[PDB]
Amino acid sequence: KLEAILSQEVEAEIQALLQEAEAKAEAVKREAEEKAKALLQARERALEAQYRAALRRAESAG
Amino acid sequence: LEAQYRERERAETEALLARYRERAEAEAKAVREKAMARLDEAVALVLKEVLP
């Protein structure tokens, strides 16, 4: 009989759901890694500019 | 990242200045020595026009 088994047909639909949201808990983290990363690509280029600029000034001064 | 970029430029922008200082006084020296051996010539040239 299905009684205890009756409950495993739900626990399988409500396991489908919980995996679909651990396929969103991965997507969210992808976007957030690609965000955190890009905030440091902007950090890299802007500093590089300010170091190109600081030595160029100090040459014209010299 | 800021911290080691600011410390990157500083440790070059003292060295560069220090070295430019060595060159400034040698390039001052490089025009003086030419001049004092082309000296009797300026003095002569000036003089011939201050006595009319």
Swiss-Prot record, chain A:
Family membership noted in the UniProt record: Belongs to the V-ATPase E subunit family.
Function: Produces ATP from ADP in the presence of a proton gradient across the membrane.
The protein's name: V-type ATP synthase subunit E
Upper lineage: Bacteria, Thermotogati, Deinococcota, Deinococci, Thermales
Gene name as annotated: atpE
